[PDB]
Amino acid sequence: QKKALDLAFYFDRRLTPEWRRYLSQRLGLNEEQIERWFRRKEQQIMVSKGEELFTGVVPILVELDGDVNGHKFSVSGEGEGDATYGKLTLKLICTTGKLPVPFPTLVTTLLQCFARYPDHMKQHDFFKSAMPEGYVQERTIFFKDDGNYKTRAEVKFEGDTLVNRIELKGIDFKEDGNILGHKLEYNYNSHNVYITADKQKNGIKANFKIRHNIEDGGVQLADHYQQNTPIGDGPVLLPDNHYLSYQSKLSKDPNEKRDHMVLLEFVTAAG
Amino acid sequence: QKKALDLAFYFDRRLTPEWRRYLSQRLGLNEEQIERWFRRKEQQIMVSKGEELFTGVVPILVELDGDVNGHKFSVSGEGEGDATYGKLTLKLICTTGKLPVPFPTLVTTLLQCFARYPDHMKQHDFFKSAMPEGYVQERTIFFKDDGNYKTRAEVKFEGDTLVNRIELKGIDFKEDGNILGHKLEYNYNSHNVYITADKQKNGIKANFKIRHNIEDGGVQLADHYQQNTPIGDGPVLLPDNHYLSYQSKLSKDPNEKRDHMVLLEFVTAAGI
Numbered sequence: 001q002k003k004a005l006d007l008a009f010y011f012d013r014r015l016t017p018e019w020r021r022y023l024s025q026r027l028g029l030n031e032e033q034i035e036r037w038f039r040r041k042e043q044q045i046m047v048s049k050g051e052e053l054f055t056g057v058v059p060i061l062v063e064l065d066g067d068v069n070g071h072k073f074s075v076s077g078e079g080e081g082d083a084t085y086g087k088l089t090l091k092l093i094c095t096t097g098k099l100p101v102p103f104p105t106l107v108t109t110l111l112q113c114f115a116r117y118p119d120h121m122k123q124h125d126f127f128k129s130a131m132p133e134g135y136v137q138e139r140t141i142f143f144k145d146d147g148n149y150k151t152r153a154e155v156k157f158e159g160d161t162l163v164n165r166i167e168l169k170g171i172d173f174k175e176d177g178n179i180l181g182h183k184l185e186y187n188y189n190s191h192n193v194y195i196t197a198d199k200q201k202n203g204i205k206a207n208f209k210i211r212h213n214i215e216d217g218g219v220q221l222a223d224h225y226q227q228n229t230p231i232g233d234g235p236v237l238l239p240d241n242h243y244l245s246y247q248s249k250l251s252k253d254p255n256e257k258r259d260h261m262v263l264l265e266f267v268t269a270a271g
Numbered sequence: 272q273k274k275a276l277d278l279a280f281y282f283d284r285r286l287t288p289e290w291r292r293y294l295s296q297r298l299g300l301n302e303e304q305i306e307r308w309f310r311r312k313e314q315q316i317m318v319s320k321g322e323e324l325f326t327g328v329v330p331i332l333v334e335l336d337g338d339v340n341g342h343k344f345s346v347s348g349e350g351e352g353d354a355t356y357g358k359l360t361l362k363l364i365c366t367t368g369k370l371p372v373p374f375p376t377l378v379t380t381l382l383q384c385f386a387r388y389p390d391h392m393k394q395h396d397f398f399k400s401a402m403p404e405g406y407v408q409e410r411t412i413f414f415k416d417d418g419n420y421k422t423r424a425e426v427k428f429e430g431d432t433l434v435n436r437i438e439l440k441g442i443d444f445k446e447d448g449n450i451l452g453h454k455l456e457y458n459y460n461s462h463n464v465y466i467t468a469d470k471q472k473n474g475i476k477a478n479f480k481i482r483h484n485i486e487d488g489g490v491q492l493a494d495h496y497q498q499n500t501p502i503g504d505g506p507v508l509l510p511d512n513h514y515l516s517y518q519s520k521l522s523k524d525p526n527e528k529r530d531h532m533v534l535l536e537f538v539t540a541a542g543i
Contacts, residue, residue, distance in 0.1 A: 011320040013284070014505055018403045018428055025430030049282040053293075132289040157289055159296035234285055 001027070005037055013042065043123050046237055050128030054083040054113070059161045062090065062110060068170030069147070069180065071100040077110060079263075081162060083128070086116030086267045091253060093260040101170070102184040103261040104212055107248060108141070108224060109151050110263065111164055115244050118271030124239035125269070126195075126204045126228065132157035133232025135203065144221035147173035156231060178212070178220045185213035188248040197238045203228045204239060242270035273298060276308050284313070313506050314394050321399030324428075325354040325384065332434045333361060333381055339420070339441030340451065342371040346381065352433060354399075357387025359536045364529045372441070373455040374532040375483055378519060379412070379495060380422050382435055386515050386538040395510035395540070397466075397475045397499065403428035404503025406474065415492040418444030427502060449483070449491045456484035459519040463541075468509040474500040475510065513542030 008023050015038045024031045062077035079090035092103075092110050099106075113127035127135065134156025141149035153166040173180050189211055198205040205227045212220040230236050244267050251262040275298050283290055286309045295302050328351050335346040348363035363374075363381055370377075384398035398406070405427025412420035424437035444451050460482055469476040476498045483491040501507050515538050522533040 007323070011316060011323070012505070014503075016404055016503065018405070018503075021430050022403045022428045025432075045282060052278075052282065132293045133287055134289070157293045159292045232285075232287060232289070234283070 001029075005029075005034070009038065009041055013038070042235055043237065046129045046235060047122050047125075050125060050131065051122070053131050053157070054081075054128055056084075057082050058114075060088075060090065060111060060164070061158075061161055062092065062164045062166070064092075064106070064110065064166040064168060066101075066168040066170075068101055068149075068168075069173045069175070071180075072096065073099055073101075075099070075106070075110070081111060081114035083114045083116060086114065088114045088263070088265040088267065090263045091256075091260065092263060093256065093258050095258070097259070099259045101179050102182055102186070102212075104184055104186060104188060104250065105141075105143075105149070105179055105222065106168075106261075107188060107250070107263065108210060108222075109139070109149070109153070109166060109168060110261075111155060111162060112137075112244065112267065113155060113162065115267040115269055117269040121242065121269055121271050123237055124242055126237050126239055127155075129235075129237035130203075130228075130230045130232070133230070133234065135231055136229045137226065138228075139224055139226045142221075142223040142225075143173075143177075143179060144223070145174075146177045146179055146220075147171055154231070178214055183215050184220060185215055186250055187213060188250055189213075190245070190247045192243045192245050194241070194243045195239055196241050198227060198229075199238060201227070201229050202236060202238070203230055244269055273300075276305070280309065280312055284309070314508065317400045317506060317508055318393045318396075321393070321396060321402065324402050325352070325399055327355070328353050329385075330432045331359075331361060331382065332429075332432055333363060333437075334435070335363075335377070335381060335437045335439060337377075337437075337439035337441075339372055339418070339439070340444050340446075343367075344370060344372075346370070346377070348381065352382060352385030354385045354387055357385070357537050357539045359385045359534075359538065361534045362524060362527070362531060363534060364527075364531045366529075369530045372450055373453055373457070373483075375455055375457065375459055375521065376414075376420070376450055376493065377439075377532075378459060378521070378534060379481060379493075380410070380420070380424070380437060380439060381532075381534065382426060382433065383408075383515065383538070384426065384433065385536075386540050388540040392513065392540050392543065394508055395466075395513055397468075397508050397510055398426075400506070400508035401474075401499075401501045401503065402433075404501065404505060406499045406501050408497065408499050410495055410497045413492075413494040413496075414444075414448075414450060415494070416445075417448045417450060417491075418442055425502065449485055454486050455491060456486055457521055458484060459521050460484070461516070461518045463514045463516050465512070465514045466510055467512050469498060469500075470509060472498065472500045473507060473509070474498065511543075513540055515540050 064075040066073045073096045077092035117125040137153040139151045193208045210222040247266045249264040333348040345366045350361035388396040408424045410422045421440040481493040518537045520535045
């Protein structure tokens, strides 16, 4: 009755059919009850681990390799994430010269592991649970009446640092359109992103529309379709339906002559 | 000093490169040290885990399904291991009438997890570390101037019962030879079996000779070649070189009508 369950867990958390049956017949407890106890303890540990890895300020490195209608560019970033306050701070610099797209179209692409999940729903935070091996984030971004972005991001710890390498491809863009023609305002609205579980891929998915302000009136729609998949083998947290509430501020560094964006975001989960 | 490792280990026992590199930088320790610390932990745990799983008296079920030279036969048995005393006791009945080989030629085939490892050697006990998922035990047995056995067995827990399930194939056997002709004494010689790690297969191997007494004089050699491989994905204990000392007593159950063998083995690990 209990007690030995702790010991069993300490010995071996790989609840295989054989380990389950063994513990069943050996404790009188039935298999489902053992399954439930194990999954429960696993969750609590998954929660405590994520809290540990994301306590305090976490240094961030970002590398984005881009190609939009053959126009190639690189963007590198650094800054920090403070999940306690749902705070993400980044300075992103285009290193190849002039960014051929407007920076706000890259805002969604440029680390949801930094969201502030309230205590009562920390067991729904997939993004942290994937650490340190990380997760792959893929998105397709459809700009209405214009082309599309496809992105592939790999978010993981490399040592003490949270790293994000991204590859981006954009095709079918209008050279005189809102994107390649630089007709979008340098600002950002608040949005809610709805997260659901992607169980057949052991992760999560989301879709959401960003509204970009066209200069002197009008909106450029950007329709986002997103999928996240764990990279490693460990257990992860699969969330019930919830959402992330975003605020973003875009600014500049007065001393940085290179084409760049300063990004501040606050992210809080549906609690 | 650093109880961080313990907490890290509590959190996540899968020391991937990412987990390793992370823990290294956050704690300021080198990757090797962490690898080492985690390894020493897992070993202590496997040792404790084995002890718990074999602590008092464990029931055993054996089921053998065999065909030597067309002659198909079934042996089934039960008993109990008491690894604390290195002891094993089985009553093995041939469920299909009469056995077409001598029971002594099946002794090695018909549970090395019930060996007694002395405390200073328990980290070398592969057989227990593989439980409860178990291991596959394969052997070829060459009977000099005669046929050969080929065996594959699975030794795994099913509930709290240790189970040995075996397939046996014997070919090229002389019809009036020592085996099919039934010319072997009903007894068994004591000796040592030398274990080595088989790192490639994540398990162990051993070869050894059994000398079976031919009736009225002489000896029938049975050269054993053996390999064991985990069934599960869990970690296992890979031993340094050592041996198991065997003593076997074959007997009969007076009130038992069926063609059978009562086997009792004492098994103790040694070397260092």
